[PDB]
């Protein structure tokens, strides 16, 4: 997995960059692949850095992700909401689950998808895993249900839609074209 | 291990890995399976080359069996969005999403080498559809939406009838460079 090296020109010098660091200079930040603590924290780190470079310029968050960890996703989410810069979001390839959540979370008016992007939203899943006493299962089921309620409430607000719609429409895997995601209220514009 | 080469120039001279050296001349490679990582890398290079010069052609060299549909589409939308013409060139093979991206190059500027192999077919899934019948219907329906979209876009890429693409992608369809040109998938063969 070689990463190309490119050259930038500027006042008093010439400088060599891996191409993603090169795009970071233009305030483009990527979330690609599964959302993990490490991939999410890297995004958080880039967002904070870009704000310190310039607190008023937009940041461009490019998303191609199937989703992943809910808490890791929330750390990006809360960071997007905290900092002064507008975080434009853009979907290329796909924004599924927590990917779709983060996409829908961009500054309203500045949420984009490319024409053949795919969006998918659904209720929380836990992958197979769970053992224990009936007491412990109750506690974790209850927690999973709180997360479900929060995500529906937040998505409804991102989407400027009724909660009951999100509850209905996320009961099972819900695939949307770019056009449908815009009709739903999840993104603002489709780029051609 | 990637060889190190020296760009001699009006800069003095710099060391480059050979692929970065080729990127300087606006050559971009898609080699091997299309994954989120390899596709996004290609996207970054397309965006970067456009920023370098939005008017010069970009040369996208493809040797790929295909891979992720969603990852492939991210390259496709970037090819179509950016200002530069994206010429495509097939060496070795362009199969599936590889052929799709090949076919998607700027019309008049889609090329193949004389012994390149092209293959097109309908969408496949590996791993399986499992769980509730409700869920399987949802995923089947989505797979069929993908099948319809690709046939329609390929037909447009090839300037052919939708029905031709439907019939000709029903099973694995191998083409020589000449047959691909005749099909309308590429424009010229470079001998």
């Amino acid at each position: 997995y070689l990463v190309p090296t490119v050259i930038e020109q500027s006042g008093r010098g010439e400088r060599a960059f891996d191409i993603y660091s090169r795009l970071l200079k233009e305030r483009i930040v990527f979330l690609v692949g599964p959302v993990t603590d490490e991939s999410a924290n890297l995004v958080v780190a880039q967002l904070l850095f870009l704000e310190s470079e310039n607190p008023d310029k937009d940041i461009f968050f490019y998303i191609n992700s199937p989703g992943g960890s809910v808490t890791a996703g929330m750390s990006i989410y809360d960071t997007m909401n905290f900092i002064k810069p507008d975080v434009s979001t853009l979907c290329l390839g796909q924004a599924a689950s927590m990917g779709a959540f983060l996409l829908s979370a961009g500054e309203k008016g500045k949420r984009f998808a490319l024409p053949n992007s795919r969006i998918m939203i659904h209720q929380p899943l836990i992958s197979g895993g769970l053992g224990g006493q009936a007491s412990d299962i109750e506690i974790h089921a209850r927690e999973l249900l709180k997360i479900k309620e929060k995500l529906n409430r937040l998505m409804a607000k991102h989407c400027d839609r009724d909660l009951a719609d999100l509850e209905r429409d996320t009961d099972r895997d819900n695939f949307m074209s770019a056009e449908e995601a815009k009709e739903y209220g999840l993104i603002d514009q489709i780029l051609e | 291990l990637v060889p190190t080469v020296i760009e001699q120039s009006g800069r003095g001279e710099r060391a480059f890995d050979i692929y970065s050296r080729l990127l300087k001349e606006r050559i971009v490679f898609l080699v091997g399976p299309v994954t989120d990582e390899s596709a996004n890398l290609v996207v970054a290079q397309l965006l970067f080359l456009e920023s370098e010069n939005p008017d010069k052609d970009i040369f996208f060299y493809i040797n790929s069996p295909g891979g992720s549909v969603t990852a492939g589409m991210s390259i496709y939308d970037t090819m179509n969005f950016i200002k530069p013409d994206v010429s495509t060139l097939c060496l070795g093979q362009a199969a599936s999403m590889g052929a799709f991206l090949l076919s998607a190059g700027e019309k008049g500027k889609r090329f193949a080498l004389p012994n390149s192999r092209i293959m097109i077919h309908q969408p496949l899934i590996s791993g399986g559809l499992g769980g509730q019948a409700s869920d399987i219907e949802i995923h089947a329906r989505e797979l069929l939406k993908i099948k319809e979209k690709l046939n329609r876009l390929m037909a447009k890429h090839c300037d052919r009838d939708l029905a031709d693409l439907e019939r000709d992608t029903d099973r694995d369809n191998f083409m020589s460079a000449e047959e691909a040109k005749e099909y309308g998938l590429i424009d010229q063969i470079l001998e």
Partner: peptide, 6 residues
């Protein structure tokens, strides 16, 4: 991807 991002 500009306009408008960037």
């Amino acid at each position: 991807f500009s306009p408008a991002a960037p």
